[PDB]
C-alpha cells in the first residue's frame, strides 16, 4: 503493499484513494526510491486537501528526500501559498536546509514567489541564511534585479 | 584606336561611373541620347575621345563601360535616369542577391552565378576595339561586392587579357560615411588577390572627400550625390590624357611608366585644386603658382595622410585650363626650393607636366564653381603607406578574436586567407619602408 | 533581396503577431479586406517585403499562423484584421499542447510540423528572392516554444541559404502561468543557439516592469505588455518596409550585428515608452531620444547593459527631425560611455533616419544592441531551470513523452556555455 500506492495516489491528487489506503493501514511515512513521502508529493503537485489529510494523521511535516528537501522546500519552490502556510500551522522548519544550501526562502525568492516570500519571513526564515555559494535571499534579488523582492526583503 | 573599357562594379562603382560618364558626355559635347553634332565623323571616327566613345551608324555615341552589380537597386536607375539611352542595355548587368557586404559571396558563392555572363559581355566590347590597351575598374574596399567580385573579376580578366592593362579606382573606408563592420576585412582581402592583377591603383579616401564638402564646399552632411560628383571631377582629371590630346600619360601603359617605380607600390596619390563652392561664383581667380602650392596641402588630398612624412618616387602634374607652361616651370621652381619634398635618390627628380587648354568642366546640379584653371597632381609617395596601416589596425582588432570570421568561411573560403592577407599587407607595409 | 515568409506560432505568437500585422498594415495604408488607401508613395515600394499582391490592389500578409489548438484560430480572425490572412495559411491542431515543450517538439508538433512545411513551401514559391523566415513565439508555453524550435530546425535544413530571423518573448514570474515555464525555455535556447541567425528578446520581466514602474499600470495585462512589442517590433523592420537610402535586409543586418555565430541574441529597445492612449509624449527632442534609447528602462530585455559591454549597435530614428543633431547626440552618447563598448569591434554603432513615424507618434526611436549584459538574462532562466531541475520536480511530465534526462542536463550546460561566452568577451581587451 500500500506505500507505492498512496505515493501515486498523493501525487495525482487521488483524494478518496488516500483516505481508503490510509483506513487500510498505508505507511503515512512511506518514502521512494529517494526518499520522498507522500507529503511531499502532494506540496509538490498542489494537492491541498491531501496535504492537511496527512498532516492529521502522522505525517512528518519535516521529514527529508535523499537532496535534504522536506515539504516546505518543495511547497516554497513550486508557489502553493496556503500549502506553505499549513505547513507552517504544523511546525515546519522554516529555515530547514537541502543539499544545496537552499532554505525555503532561497526557492521562494529565485522562483519570484513574492507572496510566499512574505509568509516565510512572518515565521522567522533567516535573511543572513546562505547557500553553498555563499548567496542570501538578498543577494539573489539583487543578482537578478528583481526591485519587487529586495523590497520585500528589507521590509 | 587604343580603346579603353571601363568596368563598375558595386553600388560605390556603378554611382561613380555614372557621374563620370555624365562629366565625360558635357566634356566631349555628348547629349543624353549619345548624339554629338560636333566633330562631324558619320561612324567609328578616330578621335582621341574614341578611346572611351564607341560610334554607331546612327550618329550615337556609346560608351565603352560595364556596369555590374549583384544586387539590381543602383543599376535599374540608371536604366531609369536621365542617361538611360546612353549606355548599352546589355552592358548593364544584375543579379538577384548581393553580397550583404561578405567578400566571400562576392567572391565565391554569390559572384560565380554571374561572372561568365559578365566576361562574355566584356568579350563583346573587346571584339569593337582595334587596339584595346587594358580596362578601368570601378570599385569600393569596403563593399560585399566591391570587394569579392572585383578580385574574381580582376582575376579572370588576366587569364583572357594577359597583355592588357588594368587601373583601379578604389573607394577607401571611412567612418564618416557609412561603411559596414567588417569593411576592414573586406579591404584587405580584395587588396591581397588584386596587388599582382593591377597595374596602377587610385585610392580614394572617403573620409579626404568628406572633409572636403565640408570645408570647401560648405556642405553639412555630404551625400552619396555630393561624394561622387567631387570624386569625377578629379577621376575625370586622371583619365583627360585619355580623352583627349596629349604628351603625358597618353595610353594606360604609360601610368605605370610614369607613376608606379615597382609593381607592388602602385598606389598613386592623387590631389585636386581648386575646390571652390558654386555659391562663390563671383570668386577671385587663382594663379597657376597658387593651385600648384595647394597641391602639397594636406587638405585637398584623396587619401589622408602626411607626404611630408615620406618620400617621393614620382610625381606627375595634370593642368586643365588657362595655364602658361612658363608659369608652371616658375611654380615648380618655387616647390623645389622653398618646400622640403624628399624625393628618393634611384629615381629622376623631376616633374612630369601635362596641360589640357580646356577649361574644367562642371555638372549643372553640382556643387562645384567653375574656375579658369585646376591641376590634378598624381604623385606616388610613401606616406600612402599610413592608409595601409589604418586599415591593418582595425583589420587586427578584430582577428585578434576572430569576430566575423563564420561569415566568411561559411560562403566557401578557408579561414587561412584571412592570415595571408594580413601577411602580404604586412610585406606591403614592408616595402614602403625599405623604399625610404 | 526582399520577400519575407512569417511564421507565428503558438498563443502569445499569435497574439503578438497579428499586432504586428494590424500595426504594419496601418503604417503602409492596409485596411482589413486588403485594399491599399495610403496617401504616400513611399508606403508601397517595398511592400513585397510583407505582403503579397493579389488580384486587385488586394495586398494579402504572407504570414503563416501555426498553432497546435483551435482556440486562438477563431482569435485571431475576430481581430480587427483578422479577414486578411490567407484562410488556407492556418494551420492549427486539435489537441493542445498544455505549456509541454515535449509535447510540441515531439508528439503533438511533430504530427503537425509537415504539415506546416508545405504552406511554407509554397509561400516560398511564389517568391521572386526570398531572404529568410521571421518567427514570432514565446519560449514559456509548449506550442511556440516547442513546435516553433521544430520548425525552425525544419526549415533550417530545407533553406540553408536563408536568414532564420527569430521575436522570442522570454517568460517571467512577473507574468507566470506555470513554473514549468524555465524547462520550456532552457530547452529552447538550446535550439535557437544552433539554429537562427536572429533573435530578438522580448523579456515579459520587463514588459511587466515597464508597465508597472514606469507607465504606473498598478495591474498590467497582455494587451498592454503586447502594445511594447508592437511598438518594438515595428521599430526592428522599419529599415526593412520602407525606403531610406540605405541597404537593409536579413543578412546584411546579422553580418553586422553577429560577431560570433551563437551571441546573436539583441537587445531591443524603444523611445519614448507610451500606454495605450494617453497622449502623454507630446515634446520629445533628439537629445531625449538618443538618452531614453540608451537608458535600460527602455530596454524590452530586463537586463542593465552598463553591466556589460555592447558588442554592436544599431539605431533607427523616425520621423522629422535633423540628421544634423542625430550624428553629434550619438556622438556623444558614444563618447561618455566609452568603455560601455568594445574597442576590438571599431566603429560598432551604426545610425539611421526615417521619414515615416509610427502611429500616434511624431518622433521614435528604437534601439538593437548585441551586449554582453543580455547573458543577465540567462542566468534568470538558468537559475529558475536550476532549482527546479535539481528536484526532478514535474519531469516526467517530459520524460513521459519520449524526452531523456539528458536532454535536461544538455540544455542547462550548453545555456551555462552561453553565459560564459559573453563574459569571455566582456572582460577581452585589446593590448
Ligand atoms: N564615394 C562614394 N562611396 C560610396 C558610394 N556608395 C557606397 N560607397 C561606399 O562603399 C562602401 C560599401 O560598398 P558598396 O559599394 O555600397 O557595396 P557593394 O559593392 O554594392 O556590395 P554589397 O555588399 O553586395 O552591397 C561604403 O563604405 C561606402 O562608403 C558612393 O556612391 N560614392
Ligand atoms: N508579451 C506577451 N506574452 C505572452 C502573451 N501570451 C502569453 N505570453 C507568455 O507566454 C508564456 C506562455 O506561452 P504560450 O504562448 O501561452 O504557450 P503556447 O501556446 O504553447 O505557445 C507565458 O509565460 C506568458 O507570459 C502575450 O499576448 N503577450
Ligand atoms: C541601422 O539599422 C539597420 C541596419 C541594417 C544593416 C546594416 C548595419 N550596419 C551596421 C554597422 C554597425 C553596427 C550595426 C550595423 S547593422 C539592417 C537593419 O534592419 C534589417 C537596420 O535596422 C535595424
Ligand atoms: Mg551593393
Given at each position: 503493499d500500500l506505500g507505492k500506492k498512496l505515493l501515486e495516489a498523493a501525487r495525482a491528487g487521488q483524494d478518496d484513494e488516500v483516505r481508503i489506503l490510509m483506513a487500510n493501514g498505508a505507511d503515512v511515512n512511506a518514502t521512494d526510491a529517494s526518499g520522498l513521502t507522500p507529503l511531499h508529493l502532494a506540496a509538490t503537485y498542489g494537492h491541498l486537501e491531501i496535504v492537511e489529510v496527512l498532516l492529521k494523521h502522522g505525517a512528518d511535516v519535516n521529514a527529508i528526500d535523499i537532496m535534504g528537501s522536506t515539504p516546505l522546500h518543495l511547497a516554497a519552490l513550486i508557489g502553493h501559498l496556503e500549502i506553505v502556510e499549513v505547513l507552517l500551522k504544523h511546525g515546519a522548519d522554516v529555515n530547514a536546509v537541502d543539499t544545496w544550501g537552499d532554505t525555503p526562502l532561497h526557492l521562494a525568492a529565485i522562483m519570484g514567489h513574492l507572496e510566499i516570500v512574505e509568509v516565510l519571513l512572518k515565521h522567522g526564515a533567516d535573511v543572513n541564511a546562505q547557500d553553498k555559494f555563499g548567496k542570501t535571499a538578498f543577494d539573489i534579488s539583487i543578482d537578478n534585479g528583481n526591485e519587487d523582492l529586495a523590497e520585500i526583503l528589507q521590509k | 584606336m587604343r580603346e579603353c573599357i571601363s568596368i563598375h562594379v558595386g553600388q560605390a562603382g556603378v554611382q561613380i561611373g555614372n557621374a563620370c560618364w555624365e562629366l565625360y558626355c558635357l566634356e566631349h559635347g555628348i547629349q543624353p541620347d549619345g548624339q554629338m553634332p560636333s566633330d562631324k565623323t558619320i561612324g567609328g571616327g578616330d578621335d582621341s575621345f574614341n578611346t572611351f566613345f564607341s560610334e554607331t551608324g546612327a550618329g550615337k555615341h556609346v560608351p565603352r563601360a560595364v556596369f555590374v552589380d549583384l544586387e539590381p537597386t543602383v543599376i535599374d536607375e540608371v536604366r531609369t535616369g536621365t542617361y538611360r539611352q546612353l549606355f548599352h542595355p546589355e552592358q548593364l548587368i544584375t543579379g538577384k542577391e548581393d553580397a550583404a557586404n561578405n567578400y566571400a559571396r562576392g567572391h565565391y558563392t554569390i559572384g560565380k552565378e554571374i561572372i561568365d555572363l559578365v566576361l562574355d559581355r566584356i568579350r563583346k566590347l573587346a571584339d569593337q576595339c582595334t587596339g584595346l590597351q587594358g580596362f578601368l575598374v570601378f570599385h569600393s574596399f569596403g563593399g560585399g561586392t566591391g570587394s569579392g567580385f572585383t578580385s574574381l573579376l580582376m582575376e579572370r580578366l588576366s587569364v583572357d587579357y594577359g597583355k592588357k592593362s588594368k587601373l583601379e579606382f578604389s573607394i577607401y573606408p571611412a567612418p564618416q560615411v557609412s561603411t559596414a563592420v567588417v569593411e576592414p576585412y573586406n579591404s584587405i582581402l580584395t587588396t591581397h588577390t588584386t596587388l599582382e592583377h593591377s597595374d596602377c591603383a587610385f585610392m580614394v579616401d572617403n573620409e579626404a572627400i568628406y572633409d572636403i564638402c565640408r570645408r570647401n564646399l560648405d556642405i553639412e552632411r555630404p551625400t552619396y550625390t555630393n561624394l561622387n560628383r567631387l570624386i569625377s571631377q578629379i577621376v575625370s582629371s586622371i583619365t583627360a590624357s585619355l580623352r583627349f590630346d596629349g604628351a603625358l600619360n597618353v595610353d594606360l601603359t604609360e601610368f605605370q611608366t610614369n607613376l608606379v617605380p615597382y609593381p607592388r607600390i602602385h598606389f598613386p596619390l592623387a590631389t585636386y585644386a581648386p575646390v571652390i563652392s558654386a555659391e562663390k561664383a563671383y570668386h577671385e581667380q587663382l594663379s597657376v603658382a597658387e593651385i600648384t602650392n595647394a597641391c602639397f596641402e594636406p587638405a585637398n588630398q584623396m587619401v589622408k595622410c602626411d607626404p611630408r612624412h615620406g618620400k617621393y618616387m614620382a610625381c606627375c602634374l595634370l593642368y586643365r585650363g588657362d595655364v602658361v607652361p612658363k608659369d608652371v616651370n616658375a611654380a615648380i621652381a618655387t616647390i623645389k626650393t622653398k618646400r622640403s619634398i624628399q624625393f628618393v635618390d634611384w629615381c629622376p627628380t623631376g616633374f612630369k607636366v601635362g596641360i589640357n587648354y580646356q577649361p574644367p568642366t562642371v555638372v549643372p546640379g553640382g556643387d562645384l564653381a567653375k574656375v579658369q584653371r585646376a591641376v590634378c597632381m598624381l604623385s606616388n609617395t610613401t606616406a600612402i603607406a599610413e592608409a595601409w596601416a589604418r586599415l591593418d589596425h582595425k583589420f587586427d582588432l578584430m582577428y585578434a578574436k576572430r569576430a566575423f570570421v563564420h561569415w566568411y568561411v561559411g560562403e566557401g573560403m578557408e579561414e587561412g586567407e584571412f592570415s595571408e592577407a594580413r601577411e602580404d599587407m604586412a610585406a606591403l607595409e614592408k616595402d614602403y619602408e625599405e623604399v625610404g | 533581396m526582399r520577400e519575407i515568409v512569417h511564421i507565428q506560432a503558438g498563443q502569445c505568437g499569435n497574439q503578438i503577431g497579428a499586432k504586428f500585422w494590424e500595426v504594419i498594415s496601418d503604417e503602409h495604408g492596409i485596411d482589413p479586406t486588403g485594399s491599399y488607401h495610403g496617401d504616400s508613395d513611399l508606403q508601397l515600394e517595398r511592400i513585397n517585403v510583407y505582403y503579397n499582391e493579389a488580384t486587385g490592389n488586394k495586398y494579402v500578409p504572407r504570414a503563416i499562423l501555426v498553432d497546435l489548438e483551435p482556440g486562438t484560430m477563431d482569435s485571431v480572425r475576430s481581430g480587427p484584421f483578422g479577414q486578411i490572412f490567407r484562410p488556407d495559411n492556418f494551420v492549427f491542431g486539435q489537441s493542445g499542447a498544455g505549456n509541454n515543450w515535449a509535447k510540441g517538439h515531439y508528439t503533438?508538433?511533430?504530427?503537425?510540423?509537415?504539415?506546416?512545411?508545405?504552406?511554407?513551401?509554397?509561400?516560398?514559391?511564389?517568391?521572386?528572392?526570398?531572404?529568410?523566415?521571421?518567427?514570432?513565439?514565446?519560449?514559456?508555453?509548449?506550442?511556440?516554444?516547442?513546435?516553433?524550435?521544430?520548425?525552425?530546425?525544419?526549415?533550417?535544413?530545407?533553406?540553408?541559404?536563408?536568414?532564420?530571423?527569430?521575436?522570442?518573448?522570454?517568460?517571467?514570474?512577473?507574468?507566470?502561468?506555470?513554473?514549468?515555464?524555465?524547462?520550456?525555455?532552457?530547452?529552447?535556447?538550446?535550439?535557437?543557439?544552433?539554429?537562427?541567425?536572429?533573435?530578438?528578446?522580448?523579456?515579459?520581466?520587463?514588459?511587466?516592469?515597464?508597465?508597472?514602474?514606469?507607465?504606473?499600470?498598478?495591474?498590467?495585462?497582455?494587451?498592454?505588455?503586447?502594445?511594447?512589442?508592437?511598438?518594438?517590433?515595428?521599430?526592428?523592420?522599419?529599415?526593412?518596409?520602407?525606403?531610406?537610402?540605405?541597404?537593409?535586409?536579413?543578412?546584411?543586418?546579422?553580418?553586422?550585428?553577429?560577431?560570433?555565430?551563437?551571441?546573436?541574441?539583441?537587445?531591443?529597445?524603444?523611445?519614448?515608452?507610451?500606454?495605450?492612449?494617453?497622449?502623454?509624449?507630446?515634446?520629445?527632442?533628439?537629445?531625449?531620444?538618443?538618452?531614453?534609447?540608451?537608458?535600460?528602462?527602455?530596454?524590452?530585455?530586463?537586463?542593465?547593459?552598463?553591466?556589460?559591454?555592447?558588442?554592436?549597435?544599431?539605431?533607427?530614428?523616425?520621423?522629422?527631425?535633423?540628421?544634423?543633431?542625430?550624428?553629434?547626440?550619438?556622438?556623444?552618447?558614444?563618447?561618455?560611455?566609452?568603455?560601455?563598448?568594445?574597442?576590438?569591434?571599431?566603429?560598432?554603432?551604426?545610425?539611421?533616419?526615417?521619414?515615416?513615424?509610427?502611429?500616434?507618434?511624431?518622433?521614435?526611436?528604437?534601439?538593437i544592441g548585441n551586449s554582453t549584459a543580455i547573458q543577465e538574462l540567462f542566468k534568470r532562466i538558468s537559475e529558475q531551470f536550476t532549482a527546479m531541475f535539481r528536484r526532478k520536480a514535474f519531469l516526467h511530465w517530459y520524460t513521459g513523452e519520449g524526452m531523456d534526462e539528458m536532454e535536461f542536463t544538455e540544455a542547462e550546460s550548453n545555456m551555462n556555455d552561453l553565459v560564459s561566452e559573453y563574459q569571455q568577451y566582456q572582460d577581452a581587451t585589446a593590448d
Open positions: - | - | 503533438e508538433g511533430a504530427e503537425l510540423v509537415d504539415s506546416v512545411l508545405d504552406v511554407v513551401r509554397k509561400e516560398s514559391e511564389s517568391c521572386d528572392c526570398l531572404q529568410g523566415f521571421q518567427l514570432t513565439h514565446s519560449l514559456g508555453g509548449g506550442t511556440g516554444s516547442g513546435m516553433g524550435t521544430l520548425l525552425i530546425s525544419k526549415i533550417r535544413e530545407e533553406y540553408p541559404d536563408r536568414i532564420m530571423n527569430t521575436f522570442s518573448v522570454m517568460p517571467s514570474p512577473k507574468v507566470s502561468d506555470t513554473v514549468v515555464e524555465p524547462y520550456n525555455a532552457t530547452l529552447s535556447v538550446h535550439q535557437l543557439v544552433e539554429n537562427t541567425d536572429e533573435t530578438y528578446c522580448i523579456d515579459n520581466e520587463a514588459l511587466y516592469d515597464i508597465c508597472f514602474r514606469t507607465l504606473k499600470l498598478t495591474t498590467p495585462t497582455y494587451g498592454d505588455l503586447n502594445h511594447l512589442v508592437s511598438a518594438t517590433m515595428s521599430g526592428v523592420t522599419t529599415c526593412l518596409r520602407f525606403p531610406g537610402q540605405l541597404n537593409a535586409d536579413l543578412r546584411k543586418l546579422a553580418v553586422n550585428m553577429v560577431p560570433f555565430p551563437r551571441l546573436h541574441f539583441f537587445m531591443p529597445g524603444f523611445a519614448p515608452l507610451t500606454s495605450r492612449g494617453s497622449q502623454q509624449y507630446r515634446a520629445l527632442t533628439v537629445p531625449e531620444l538618443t538618452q531614453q534609447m540608451f537608458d535600460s528602462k527602455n530596454m524590452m530585455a530586463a537586463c542593465d547593459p552598463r553591466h556589460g559591454r555592447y558588442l554592436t549597435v544599431a539605431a533607427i530614428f523616425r520621423g522629422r527631425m535633423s540628421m544634423k543633431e542625430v550624428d553629434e547626440q550619438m556622438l556623444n552618447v558614444q563618447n561618455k560611455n566609452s568603455s560601455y563598448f568594445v574597442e576590438w569591434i571599431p566603429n560598432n554603432v551604426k545610425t539611421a533616419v526615417c521619414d515615416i513615424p509610427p502611429r500616434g507618434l511624431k518622433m521614435s526611436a528604437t534601439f
